[PDB]
A paper describes a structure:
The proteasome is a proteolytic machinery that executes the degradation of polyubiquitinated proteins to maintain cellular homeostasis. In the present study, we show that HPDs constitute a novel class of PIs with a unique mode of proteasome binding. In contrast, we have demonstrated that HPDs act on all three catalytic subunits of the proteasome by direct binding to the active pockets of the ß1, ß2 and ß5 subunits with a similar binding mode and kinetics.
Residue numbers in the entry:
A (entry chain O): 10 to 250
B (entry chain P): 1 to 249
C (entry chain 1): -9 to -1, 1 to 102
D (entry chain U): 4 to 247
E (entry chain R): 3 to 243
F (entry chain S): 9 to 250
G (entry chain T): 3 to 234
H (entry chain Y): -1, 1 to 195
The structure:
């Protein structure tokens, strides 16, 4: 009647409306992010929108350090982002304790995907309104991007983008790889990889950025770090040839 | 915490239908087509590796999964429900079989066990049925080769060949008029390659198509030697170079 | 091994006159050959005209006196401030004591 | 269809959770309360509406401490604030027990955030009818946080919630521009007392009592203390001066 | 842990799940019992929905609880089985702990209590059953008959009936049972039972079952022939008019 | 729909309120409290003349000094009576004395309102309120003879006389006239018989109403038919007089 | 007509909790009771309401410890639960700490107790209002408890049917009842006078009058029947 | 030690149980019946630890009586004894094992055969022509091994028993105050009104 | 709260009937038809497979006929999966009985247990009933050959001949016409096939749409044989009657 609309059971068309409305929520923040793989690095750019001048801008982030090697960027409302963030940190540390090695980027995506899948099948759990992009330079796999969503899907990407202008960003990138005919940015330095990542973000949103409009995570072999505005500024200047 | 849904979410309607099961079934119909064929000396299961964005990675999209070194599965419908179901399936093959009899379950038994998990989701409090159908292909020593279909109802049936998802009715008709009981494994692969073509809307190569065989023992895939009584897995996933190579036909 | 019990000495005495009653105790508290205190009384007024002494292991004897005083107060709550009759007090103490039949109060009780 | 606003867990077809937003209304219907991150601490203040003369002055305390170094104030349903602070207290005790150090302010925010967020996951609970302003001093400095019924929280230079938030908000905006060096704790106190008087206009009908607290390294040694006596009087006086 | 209150009050002060349970009783095959001067008879009615029915393996309508007390019901069948098991166990437990068999009243009061509990418990519905419980006390010659309803109310009856058209039979009964002259023989009592039942069931001596309880565990169920002779005898005594 | 423990906009518990409705549907029971004792009567109200009138039990003994009268769904009262009996005896085990009538009644009432679907605290295990009410009669040495009305609202009141069930107000009004502080016990008996005869559907006789009393001397006795029949006759003659 | 009041777990779009508001209403139906305090004492006075002239008058005063007790207006069994839970925390305080429980402290306990029943499904809020008096280490105390979980300390107040008459009286005579220290018989008369502003229309009998006193020289003690004739 | 003996003859089973009950230094009773009737055609004798024996026996009786009413069928002796054997094998691994030994004597009305079952407190069950628990075997088994015939009358079996009890009465230190004798045949269960 | 989504699967309709049971029985009415007939020297079980393609496997498939014992079979009409849950349970119960008593479970006791379980699902736990009806075929030495029926209400009855699933009115009427007490197994086999031939919702009855089983006494007096017929057997016997 009107209840297959409220809880995660099937509609007669075989749909799960609650999942779809959760996907709807991922965009509520109006932020765009994109990720891209270098030779030995992985970059995530995300927009940074601080509206109130009463806010401490150091505390406004949707990029999380999950483990020493794994970065996670969330598109969606902050309290669900933080719920996913905590659970992934817990999971990545547990995994280490039980299995004696670092939880790989993809394994953690799969694990979070399955957790998301559970909420789409049980009536008492709501899905979380987020999309999670995981990055690392995995010891077996290399630079890696894995993404999960409220449906329970999980996929690896050569590169990816998420948010309201995602189709623009994806088309943009698609075109570049189609042209370059390789599955990565053939660049030795992560600085020149974040610069490519910024450029292609600027050229598809049709906006320019200052140093405080952006967030940047870089993943290297055994380290994932987020950039200071001061280093963002440094690449921003370099971008303007 | 406080899971208060202890009542069933699938009930009988006055017509006598189980709504949620019909709807789940419906979600399967709209899923990508996958198929199976039983030959005399092997089984093949196949599906389409429909990439969303070409930025997504083909390998990362597995739809064909080893369950047991002699058992594979593929699906049509909601992929996350499937991934979950695969992991329960592998665990149950150990937990209710390998750890008790010291060998992997025969293919029908593993199937009735996946069927069990699915049935419960059509009856346990607080859950919806799974939105998938599986084809499961295996070989054990006393039943030889077999191919089963399992649905969100918990029902399952053995097939000489079948297909589920979008292009199932066309595929089933085409399969019916090409299946005899004297196909080699190789023939049935070729037929599977044909039948997939019709259902695959666009590009049709080894990187857009997934294929498995349940066939001969691959002692090359064992990883160890020294126990002659232990041969390789009968399950083998074909390489894109392997598919493309015989796409010249 | 840990021993949950001890002995704190003391002797008590209760006599019933035909319209009065006395309950007496020494005030010395000991451990082995040591004197812990020359004044640590162990005969108590628990209201409703009831005096009570629990002599033996002092921790148990304290614990039991606390529980009973507290059961006098709850009796009052639960029965519109009815006076606790001495016989009722006694029967209630039986139950207090027997509650620990397999980990007893190591005391001898007089009221 | 409709009815998405009836259960506490339902996403409406525009990715929203109406029960949280209705909760926000409970917040908005409440007393004004603010926070001011000064240059080595924080200041908390709240408007105690005096419904009648029968209300005993100086009592009925509203600001709460968590551990020894954190101040919490909230607007809305007061029992919901109290519940939240109880949890905060067990969550701070648990932290100190395992880790020995008093809980760092951001960690404490996440603990509160994940708890509040958690009451927007099931329809067997209701969301929190409060917005909370809290914080204090740790080994990394001063911190001010505000947290909504959605579990959303961020760090603030200044913060305000309740009936008069916009007075206070805009008012707080002024100082941010005017003092990039920050304030004296001493200065932030008086500055806070003014803002409650200003934001009082939206409740100007009823009489009111002001309550301030502060947590400052130079002034309280890192401990959250109340402002009382001759410094409270001074800052009340300072508030009366900027009016009439 | 399903504990939804299914049996609740409605504004007129009725409990509709208990009342709908009574409806289930009216539907069931009629049952009757009458008290002799020194016996009790139980009469029931055989379902005439379908034949090809195996008669020797279908559950009879009268159940022995102990060796001196029987129970017959009317209403849901599957429901009655549960009630019967519970009482058979209490019959044994009562003997195990008190070294006496149950009195008929005790056992009635037991069964009654079980039904009552189902009218007041989360997650259960009341019983769609009403029962007649008959026999003699241990070491007693006086006959006992009790009836039980889904609400958990019970009481004693000189004679009584339940189920389909019980209202009719009750009428016959109150106009045929002289409390001052109860059917002072097994024959007089078995006869009066058939007279009541037969005037609702129609000719079928295969549609009727009889069981007779005498003092000291003398409990005997009759074959159709014994019943058919009882049918035939009152066709004649009536066809003498 | 709505909870089994929800409030009406007038601040009343629906389920409690609806239960009081079931109660007014029940057979009448009356109590009168004198200083020579307390009397309880009930209207047996038999469904069919085939029903054995003896088997109707609406006045039960709780302890030797406590009696009970019931009205409503009487199956609901079984477990309340059990808990009351267990309580008076347990109290005697623990204290070597009779439980106060007040306290026993307070213990029964506690048992009510213990209903719901998961009220966060301990266990409110019971789908619905009790649909029956009790007149609890008793004596103790602190408060003499006493009469109580115990409702499913967990509330209880002490009356000097009180009627419940079908035509309580009718009966209650009649009680409000005839009751004074110096009623004899034999008076109170005839009085209960009178007021029952008014409000009973059937005509009054030892076979369809039953009388009882609790006296300090003898405790709680239920009268036999011959005993009651005689008091019917006593009243019939009393009433044929200006 | 409105769909936001079937349980306590639901916010209306205004931001209100109707189930709590309904319980609030149960109180106002309940018979009036008044509390006030000086600096040496705190009095409760309650009008117990009967059902019949054949009935008794509902006890509205409950003793919580030797230094603390309360008056109830509303659904009675909920004052039992609440008061009994207060006897417990008062007891715990004394057994474990040898410390008489602060009147403020009992107030917070009640609030958190009541709050829990307003955020969790399957529960109902408490349908009772309580006024609590006590003498602790910081003098005399009066508290007003609402089932929403709102507790306030006040020099005086009233709750229940026509509560507003007494409450208004108290608001004006405040400069006068707080200054009556060391004279409890008169703090009672002042309490009885305030409660007479809410009678519509009956006279205070000995049977319906209930005073409770607690202070510097007095443990919480409840006066009933003949003991109250003195103030009529 | 308590005496628990049984012998099955041609068409009947005989059970002999000592009548003494001793608590420490006194013989509290000399008229004790250490059997329970399970079915009309099945008898169980028991000996062992003080409280356990009757508790177990009555527990088993209740269960057999409940089965009987539920099915209107009398369970076969072999079935009754498999039930008992499982009940002891459960208890042997429980927190406080029932220390009870039993003989089961029954006429299988279906097979027209007497059957005798011996089971100890730990679940060891065995079917026998004659059996005994405790020390009872040590004195009497040489007698039965000698004189026992599968085709004995009940009279002969009663004589063989009489010998056994005499041997016991002369070589055993304890005075067991004689025995109660019971026979289970097709007509059910009867007690020999006078023996020894 | 969640109370809304609760279908209330165990309540009485105002006429005193159970919605879900009634509705479940409806579900079963759409399922393949199955027949049990008891002869003087055996029991016959025959059933129509609801679904068939030419690609379906005949021998490797079960959906109607299952062994419970070496002495008891069932024919199933309804939800296959719901039947296997109930079948496995029954199989375990029978072994429990065998382990306890060292005797094979009498057919009725097994049948009663299984009906009791169904019965439970209609009285508590808020779950849907099982969408299954069972025909039971078996031998014990108390009653010899027995035939039983059970349905979602938890009700069971004994039969000489009986049908479940689709078109039972047609089938019942047909068996009622031709059934005789003195029937032999070869007769009952034919009567069963022919009853299925006239009730099929399909054009002609072939071997590959049929399942067949028989419970015999065989050559050795004392032992009972359970024959679950191969496709080729069913086919051959189809020829030997007036079909194919």
């Amino acid at each position: 009647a009107g209840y297959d609309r409220h809880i995660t059971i099937f509609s007669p068309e075989g749909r799960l409306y609650q999942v779809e409305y959760a996907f709807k929520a991922t965009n509520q923040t109006n932020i765009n992010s994109l990720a891209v793989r270098g030779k030995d690095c992985t970059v995530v750019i995300s927009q940074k929108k601080v509206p109130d001048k009463l806010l401490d801008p150091t505390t406004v982030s949707y990029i999380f350090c999950i483990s020493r090697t794994i970065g996670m960027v969330v598109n969606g409302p902050i309290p669900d982002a933080r719920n996913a963030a905590l659970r992934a940190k817990a999971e990545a540390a547990e995994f280490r304790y039980k299995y004696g090695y670092d939880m790989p980027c993809d394994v953690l995506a799969k694990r979070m995907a399955n957790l998301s899948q559970i909420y789409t099948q049980r009536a008492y759990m709501r899905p979380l309104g987020v999309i999670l992009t995981f990055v690392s330079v995995d010891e077996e796999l290399g630079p890696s991007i894995y993404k999960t969503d409220p449906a329970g899907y999980y996929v690896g990407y050569k590169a990816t983008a998420t948010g309201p202008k995602q189709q623009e960003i994806t088309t943009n990138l698609e075109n570049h790889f189609k042209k370059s005919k390789i599955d990565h940015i053939n660049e030795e330095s992560w600085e020149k990889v974040v610069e490519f990542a910024i450029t292609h973000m600027i050229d598809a949103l049709g906006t320019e950025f200052s140093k405080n409009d952006l967030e940047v995570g870089v993943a290297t072999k055994d380290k994932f770090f987020t950039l200071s505005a001061e280093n963002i500024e440094e690449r921003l200047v370099a971008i303007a040839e | 915490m406080t899971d208060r849904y202890s009542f069933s979410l699938t009930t009988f309607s006055p017509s006598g239908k189980l709504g949620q099961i019909d709807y789940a079934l419906t979600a399967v119909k709209q899923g990508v087509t996958s198929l199976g064929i039983k030959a005399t000396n092997g089984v093949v299961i196949a599906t389409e590796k429909k990439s969303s964005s070409p930025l997504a990675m083909s390998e990362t999209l597995s739809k064909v999964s080893l369950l047991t070194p002699d058992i594979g599965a593929v699906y049509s419908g909601m992929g996350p429900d499937y991934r979950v179901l695969v992991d329960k399936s592998r665990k149950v093959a150990h937990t209710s079989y390998k750890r008790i009899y010291g060998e992997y379950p025969p293919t029908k038994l593993l199937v009735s066990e996946v069927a069990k998990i699915m049935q419960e989701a059509t009856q346990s409090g607080g859950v919806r049925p799974f939105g998938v159908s599986l084809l499961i292909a295996g070989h054990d020593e006393f039943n030889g080769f077999s191919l089963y279909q399992v649905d969100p109802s918990g029902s399952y049936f053995p097939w000489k060949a079948t297909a589920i998802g979008k292009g199932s009715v066309a595929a089933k008709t085409f399969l019916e008029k090409r299946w005899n009981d004297e196909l080699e494994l190789e023939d049935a692969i070729h037929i599977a390659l044909l039948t997939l073509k019709e259902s695959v809307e666009g590009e049709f190569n080894g990187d857009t198509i997934e294929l498995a065989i349940i066939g001969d023992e691959n002692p090359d895939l064992l990883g160890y030697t020294g126990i002659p009584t232990d041969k390789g897995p009968r399950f083998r996933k074909l390489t894109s170079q392997e598919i493309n190579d015989r796409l010249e036909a | 091994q840990f021993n949950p019990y001890g002995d704190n000495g003391g002797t008590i005495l209760g006599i019933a006159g035909e319209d009065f009653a006395v309950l007496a105790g020494d005030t010395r508290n000991i451990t082995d050959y040591s004197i812990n205190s020359r004044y640590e009384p162990k005969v108590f007024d628990c209201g409703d005209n009831i005096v009570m002494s629990a002599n033996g292991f002092a921790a148990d004897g304290d614990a039991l006196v606390k529980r009973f005083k507290n059961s006098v107060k709850w009796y009052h709550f639960d029965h519109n401030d009815k006076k606790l009759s001495i016989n009722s007090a006694a029967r209630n103490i039986q139950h207090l004591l027997y509650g620990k039949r397999f980990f007893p109060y190591y005391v001898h009780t007089i009221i | 269809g409709t009815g998405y606003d009836l259960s506490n867990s339902v996403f409406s077809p525009d990715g929203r959770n109406f029960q949280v937003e209705y909760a926000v209304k409970a917040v908005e219907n409440g007393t004004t309360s603010i926070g001011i991150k000064c240059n080595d601490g924080v200041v908390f203040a709240v408007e105690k509406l005096i419904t009648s003369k029968l209300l005993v002055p100086q009592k009925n305390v509203k600001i709460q401490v968590v551990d020894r170094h954190i101040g919490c104030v909230y607007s809305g349903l007061i029992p919901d604030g109290r519940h939240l602070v109880n949890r905060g207290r067990e969550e701070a005790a648990s932290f100190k027990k395992l880790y020995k150090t008093p809980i760092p302010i951001p960690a404490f925010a996440d603990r509160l955030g994940q708890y509040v967020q958690a009451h927007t996951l099931y329809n067997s609970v209701r969301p929190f009818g409060v917005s909370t302003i809290f914080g204090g001093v740790d080994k990394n400095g001063a911190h001010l946080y505000m947290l909504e019924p959605s579990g959303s929280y961020w760090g603030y230079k200044g913060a305000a919630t309740g009936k008069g938030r916009q007075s206070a908000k805009a008012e707080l905006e002024k100082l941010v521009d005017h003092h990039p060096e920050g304030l004296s704790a001493r200065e932030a106190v008086k500055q806070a007392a003014k803002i409650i008087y200003l934001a009082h206009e939206d409740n100007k009908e009823k009489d009111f009592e002001l309550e301030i607290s502060w947590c400052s390294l130079s002034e309280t040694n890192g401990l959250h203390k109340f402002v009382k006596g001759d410094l409270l009087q001074e800052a009340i006086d300072f508030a009366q001066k900027e009016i009439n | 842990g399903y504990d939804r209150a299914l049996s609740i009050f409605s504004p007129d002060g009725h409990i509709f799940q208990v009342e709908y349970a009574l409806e289930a009783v009216k539907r069931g095959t009629c049952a009757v019992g009458v008290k002799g001067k020194n016996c009790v008879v139980l009469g029931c009615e055989r379902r005439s929905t379908l034949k090809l029915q195996d008669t020797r393996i279908t559950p009879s309508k009268v159940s022995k609880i102990d060796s001196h007390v029987v129970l017959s019901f009317s209403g849901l069948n599957a429901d009655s089985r549960i009630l019967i098991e519970k009482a058979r166990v209490e019959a044994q437990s009562h003997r195990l702990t008190l070294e006496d068999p149950v009195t008929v009243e005790y056992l009635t009061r037991y069964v009654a209590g079980v039904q009552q509990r189902y009218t007041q418990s989360g997650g259960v519905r009341p019983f769609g059953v009403s029962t007649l419980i008959a026999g003699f006390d241990p070491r007693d010659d006086e006959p006992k008959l009790y009836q039980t309803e889904p609400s958990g109310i019970y009481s004693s009856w000189s004679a009584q009936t339940i189920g389909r058209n019980s209202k009719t039979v009750r009428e016959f009964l109150e106009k045929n049972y002289d409390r001052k002259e109860p059917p002072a023989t097994v024959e007089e009592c078995v006869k009066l039972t058939v007279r009541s039942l037969l005037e609702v069931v129609q000719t079928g001596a295969k549609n009727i079952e009889i069981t007779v309880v005498k003092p000291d565990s003398d409990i005997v169920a009759l074959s159709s022939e014994e019943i058919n002779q009882y049918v035939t005898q009152i066709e004649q005594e009536k066809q003498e008019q | 729909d709505r909870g089994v423990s929800t409030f009406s906009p007038e601040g009343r518990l629906f389920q409690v309120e609806y239960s009081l409705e079931a109660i007014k549907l029940g057979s009448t029971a009356i109590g009168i409290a004198t200083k020579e004792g307390v009397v309880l009567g009930v209207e047996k109200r038999a469904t069919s003349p085939l029903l054995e009138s003896d088997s109707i039990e609406k006045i039960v003994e709780i302890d030797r000094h406590i009696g009970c009268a019931m009205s409503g769904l009487t199956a609901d009262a079984r477990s309340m009576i059990e808990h009351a009996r267990t309580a008076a005896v347990t109290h005697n085990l623990y204290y070597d004395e009779d439980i106060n009538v007040e306290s026993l009644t307070q213990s029964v009432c506690d048992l009510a309102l213990r209903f719901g679907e998961g009220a966060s605290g301990e266990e409110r295990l019971m789908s619905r309120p009790f649909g029956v009410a009790l007149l609890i009669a008793g004596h103790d040495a602190d408060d003499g003879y006493q009469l109580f009305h115990a409702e499913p609202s967990g509330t209880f009141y002490r009356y000097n006389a009180k009627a419940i069930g079908s035509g309580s107000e009718g009966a209650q009004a009649e009680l409000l006239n005839e009751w004074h502080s110096s009623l004899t016990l034999k008076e109170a008996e005839l009085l209960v018989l009178k007021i029952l005869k008014q409000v009973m559907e059937e005509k009054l006789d030892e076979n369809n109403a039953q009388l009882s009393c609790i006296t300090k001397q003898d405790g709680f006795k239920i009268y036999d038919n011959e005993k009651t029949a005689e008091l019917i006759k006593e009243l019939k003659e009393k009433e044929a007089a200006e | 007509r409105n769909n936001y009041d079937g349980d306590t777990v639901t916010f209306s779009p205004t931001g209100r909790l109707f189930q709590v508001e309904y319980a609030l209403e149960a109180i106002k139906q309940g018979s009036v009771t008044v509390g006030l305090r000086s600096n040496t004492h705190a009095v409760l006075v309650a009008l117990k309401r009967n059902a019949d002239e054949l009935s008794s008058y509902q006890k509205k005063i409950i003793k919580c410890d030797e230094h603390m007790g309360l008056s109830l207006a509303g659904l009675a069994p909920d004052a039992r639960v609440l008061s009994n839970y207060l006897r417990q925390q008062c007891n715990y305080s004394s057994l474990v700490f040898n410390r008489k429980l602060a009147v403020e402290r009992a107030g917070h306990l009640l609030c958190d107790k009541a709050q829990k029943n307003t955020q969790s499904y399957g529960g109902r809020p408490y349908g009772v209002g309580l006024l609590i008096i006590g003498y602790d280490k910081s003098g005399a105390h009066l508290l007003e408890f609402q089932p929403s979980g709102n507790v306030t300390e006040l020099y005086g107040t009233a709750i229940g049917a026509r509560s507003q008459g007494a409450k208004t009286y108290l608001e004006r005579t405040l400069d006068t009842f707080i200054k009556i220290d060391g004279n409890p018989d008169e703090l009672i008369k002042a309490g009885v006078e305030a409660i007479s502003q809410s009678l519509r229309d009956e006279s205070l009998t000995v049977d319906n009058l209930s005073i409770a006193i607690v202070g510097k020289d007095t443990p919480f003690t409840i006066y009933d029947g003949e003991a109250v004739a003195k103030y009529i | 030690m308590d005496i628990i003996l049984g012998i099955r003859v041609q068409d009947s089973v005989i059970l002999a149980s000592s009548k003494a009950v001793t608590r420490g230094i006194s013989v509290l009773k000399d008229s004790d019946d250490k059997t329970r009737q399970l079915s009309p055609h099945t008898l169980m004798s028991f000996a062992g630890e003080a409280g356990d024996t009757v508790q177990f026996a009555e527990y088993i009786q209740a269960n057999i009586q409940l089965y009987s009413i539920r099915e209107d069928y009398e369970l076969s002796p072999q079935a009754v004894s498999s039930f008992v054997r499982q009940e002891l094998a459960k208890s042997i691994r429980s927190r406080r094992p029932y220390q009870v030994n039993v003989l089961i004597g029954g006429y299988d009305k279906k097979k027209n055969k007497p059957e005798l079952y011996q089971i100890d407190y730990l679940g060891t069950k065995v079917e026998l022509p004659y059996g005994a628990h405790g020390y009872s075997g040590f004195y009497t088994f040489s007698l039965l091994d000698h004189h026992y015939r599968p085709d004995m009358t009940t009279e002969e079996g009663l004589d063989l028993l009489k010998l056994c009890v005499q041997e016991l009465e002369k070589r055993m230190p304890m005075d067991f105050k004689g025995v109660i004798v019971k026979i289970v045949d097709k007509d059910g269960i009867r007690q020999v009104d006078d023996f020894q | 709260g969640s109370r809304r989504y609760d279908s209330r699967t165990t309540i009485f309709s105002p006429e005193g009937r159970l919605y879900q049971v009634e509705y479940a029985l409806e579900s079963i009415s759409h399922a393949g038809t199955a027949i049990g007939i008891m002869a003087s020297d055996g029991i016959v079980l025959a059933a129509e497979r609801k679904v068939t393609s030419t690609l379906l496997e005949q021998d490797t498939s079960t959906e109607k006929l299952y062994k419970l014992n070496d002495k008891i079979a069932v024919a199933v009409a309804g939800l296959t999966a719901d039947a296997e849950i109930l079948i496995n349970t029954a199989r375990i119960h029978a072994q429990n009985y065998l382990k306890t008593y060292n005797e094979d479970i009498p057919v009725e006791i097994l049948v009663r247990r299984l009906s009791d379980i169904k019965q439970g699902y209609t009285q508590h736990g808020g779950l849907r009933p099982f969408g299954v009806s069972f025909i039971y075929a078996g031998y014990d030495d108390r009653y010899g050959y027995q035939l039983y029926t059970s349905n979602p209400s938890g009700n069971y009855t004994g039969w000489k001949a009986i049908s479940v699933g689709a078109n039972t009115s047609a089938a019942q009427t047909l068996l009622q016409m031709d059934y005789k007490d003195d029937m032999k197994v070869d007769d009952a086999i034919e009567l069963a096939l022919k009853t299925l031939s006239k009730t099929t919702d399909s054009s002609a009855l072939t071997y590959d749409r049929l399942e067949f089983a028989t419970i015999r006494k065989g050559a050795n007096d004392g032992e009972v044989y359970q024959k679950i017929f191969k496709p080729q057997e069913i086919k051959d016997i189809l020829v030997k009657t007036g079909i194919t």
